[PDB]
Amino acid sequence: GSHMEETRELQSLAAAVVPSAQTLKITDFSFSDFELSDLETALCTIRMFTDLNLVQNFQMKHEVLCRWILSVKKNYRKNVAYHNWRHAFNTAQCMFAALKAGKIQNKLTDLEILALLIAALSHDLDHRGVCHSIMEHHHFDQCLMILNSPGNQILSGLSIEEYKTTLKIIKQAILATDLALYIKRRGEFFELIRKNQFNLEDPHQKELFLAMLMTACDLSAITKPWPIQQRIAELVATEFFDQGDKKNKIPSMQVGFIDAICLQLYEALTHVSEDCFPLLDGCRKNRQKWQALAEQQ
């Protein structure tokens, strides 16, 4: 958009009243953004930061937060069917739901939460594309550029060390969305859980969990109510077909993706917190739906 248009958008956002988390429904794991305008996703984002006490705990100026959110949004690579602002926004919303409804908040520090939210919203910036097609390598560089860009520095209130720590976690969180990295480190996570040895007090295990949580939120579309999951799966297919430039196999592949990548993760997450069960439940239900189709409806 033009300079004038971007200015009007910022004006509208900054002056808008931010509805409660309840009104926005961002606490629900089944949340959908289909009917929301970009402005509304921005208000939802502000609410996430607010109810997670980030605005307060880190002294974020309203205007700066609004500007940073809009700067992240407008900077998403255009013409990408799935990995775009909406997916990033949804990843952040799932993170918020997991921290609140999933009750994972009290297990993390304010800096880890700060970093996780920022990474969720920024992880698909500078999307380049590429089975092995779902093995994308993410890029945290643009995330940091925007975070450090004049007028958008929402971490300005952090001490030198808090800032250095936050950036380290942000980098780890973004890289964690690389499925190759998830596949590489998940074995350790699953075994710790299986042997009742999972310990969040252990720095290494805390870091491992944060990476697994990023993956869970990044793939959460697979847990949504059927009609919603069906539409987002179309977006996924469209993105791959756009790179290509078939469909009768989608059902079988969805089941394969769920069985090989998703289910065990949501099952494990449920062990860390039973309240995250909905994600597992939604995933199981979508597997059944896809299996029915695969066996030929």
Ligand X SMILES: CCCc1nc(C)c2c(=O)nc(-c3cc(S(=O)(=O)N4CCN(CC)CC4)ccc3OCC)[nH]n12
Which residue, 46 or 121, is less far from ligand X as judged by CB? 121
Answer yes or no: 62 catalytic: no
Task: Tell whether 139 is in a known binding site.
Answer: no
Rounded Cα distance, 154 and 55, in Å:
9
CA nearest neighbour of 13 among 46, 35, 36, 49: 46
Residues that bind ligand X (CB under 6 A): 82, 131, 134, 219, 221-222, 233, 236-237, 250, 253-254, 256-257, 260
Task: Tell whether 87 is in a known binding site.
Answer: yes
Tokens of 228: 């919603």
Which residue, 66 or 233, is less far from ligand X as judged by CB? 233
CA nearest neighbour of 215 among 176, 256, 172: 176
From the candidates 83, 132, 138, 204, give the one annotated as an active-site residue: 83
One DSSP character per residue, 112-154 reads HHHHHHHHHHHTTTT-----TTS------HHHHHHHHSTT--T
Rounded Cα distance, 112 and 76, in Å:
24
Task: Tell whether 124 is in a known binding site.
Answer: yes
Determine the 3-state secondary structure of 202 from DSSP: coil
User: Minimum CB separation from ligand X for residue 185, in Å?
Assistant: 17
User: Minimum CB separation from ligand X for residue 168, in Å?
Assistant: 26
Residue 107: C-alpha distances to residues 59, 60, 102, 117, 273 (Å): 22, 23, 11, 15, 10
Which residue, 145 or 294, is less far from ligand X as judged by CB? 294
Q: Find where tokens 């009290």 sit.
A: 106
Which residue, 14 or 250, is less far from ligand X as judged by CB? 250
Indicate the residue whose CB is closest to ligand X: 256
User: Minimum CB separation from ligand X for residue 217, in Å?
Assistant: 11
Is 120:176 a contact under the CB 8 Å cutoff?
Answer: no
Task: Tell whether 123 is in a known binding site.
Answer: yes
User: Minimum CB separation from ligand X for residue 179, in Å?
Assistant: 7
| Binding site, annotated residues for Mg(2+) | 124
| Binding site, annotated residues for Zn(2+) | 87, 123-124, 218
| Binding site, annotated residues | 87, 123-124, 218, 254
**Residues with active-site annotation:** 83
